[PDB]
Design a protein around this ligand. Structure first.
Ligand SMILES: Nc1ncnc2c1ncn2[C@@H]1O[C@H](CSCC[C@H](N)C(=O)O)[C@@H](O)[C@H]1O
Lengths: 253, 8
């Protein structure tokens, strides 16, 4: 049946975040087969294998080595690292809490923050340019009502996803020894940040957010983001943030 | 809201 026509070609479908699905689609235009891949935004790191309508059933870590006539040419990495679609629930953060994301692992690490009295922070492993996705913010999915109706002490890393859902990394998963599948919850706040939270559609985590650089960042530079609490609902925010906001407003004046 | 990055 092989012929030079669309039915025998390959398709790439991009998310606005720059990740993509690639492969030969079936008769209904679906990303279904044994040789489908998700390609991360570096256009190099890939999860290649069995997908059904774009959902990763068994993706093996690979490197996109070249494209020929639009067709991706992958090399599988050693180790038998496999991944699957595993969107969190209200009560389960991951079925592999200790299995790191391979793209994130090459780009960030956790260490003591340079910000005083601020615990751990997130650092770049290597020099990167502007607009680079560095890290993923995954967590359990709970309601705004639950979050808004409980103490700030429990809301240290709650991250709004949309009007219906908040992502949380509750104790003890805020410790790397118990959860390290994603690390975006380790980035500290700055009113002068070098990164932003941005939407991301992840093949393992599903629809989440990521940390993306605004500008070039050096190796070993701390990654910071604006937490974006409501300043005028004074602010509804932790005391440390309220103090820093006053200091920030003072510098602007 | 007691969470980061909500659109207000
Ligand atoms: N600018 C800042 N000043 C002080 N503390 C900060 C801060 N940004 C973040 N934090 C701290 O980081 C928490 C959010 S989660 C960020 C990672 C955290 N530092 C950790 O060690 O796991 C806050 O509850 C607060 O303890």
């Amino acid at each position: 049946g092989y012929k030079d026509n669309i039915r025998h070609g390959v398709c790439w479908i991009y998310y606005p975040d720059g990740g993509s699905l690639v492969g030969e689609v079936n008769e209904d235009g679906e990303m279904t087969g044994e040789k489908i891949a998700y390609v991360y935004p570096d256009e190099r790191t890939a999860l290649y294998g069995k997908f059904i309508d774009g959902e990763m059933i068994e993706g093996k870590l690979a490197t996109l080595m070249s494209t020929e006539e639009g067709r991706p040419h992958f090399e599988l990495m050693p180790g038998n690292s496999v991944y699957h679609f595993d969107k969190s629930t209200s009560s389960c953060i991951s079925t592999n809490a200790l299995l790191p994301d391979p793209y994130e692992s090459e780009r960030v690490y956790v260490a003591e923050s340079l910000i005083s009295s601020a615990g751990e922070g997130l650092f770049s492993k290597v020099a990167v340019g502007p607009n680079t996705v560095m890290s993923f913010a995954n967590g359990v999915r709970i309601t705004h009502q639950e979050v808004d109706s409980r103490d700030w002490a429990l809301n240290g890393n709650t991250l709004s996803l949309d009007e219906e859902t908040v992502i949380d990394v509750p104790e003890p998963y805020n410790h790397v020894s118990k959860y390290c599948a994603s690390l975006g919850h380790k980035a500290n706040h700055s009113f002068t940040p070098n990164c932003i939270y941005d939407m991301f559609v992840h093949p393992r985590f599903g629809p989440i957010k990521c940390i993306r650089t605004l500008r070039a960042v050096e190796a070993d530079e701390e990654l910071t983001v604006a937490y974006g609490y409501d300043h005028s609902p004074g602010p509804e925010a932790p005391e440390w943030y309220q103090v820093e906001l006053k200091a920030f407003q003072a510098t602007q004046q | 809201s007691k969470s980061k990055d909500r659109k207000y």
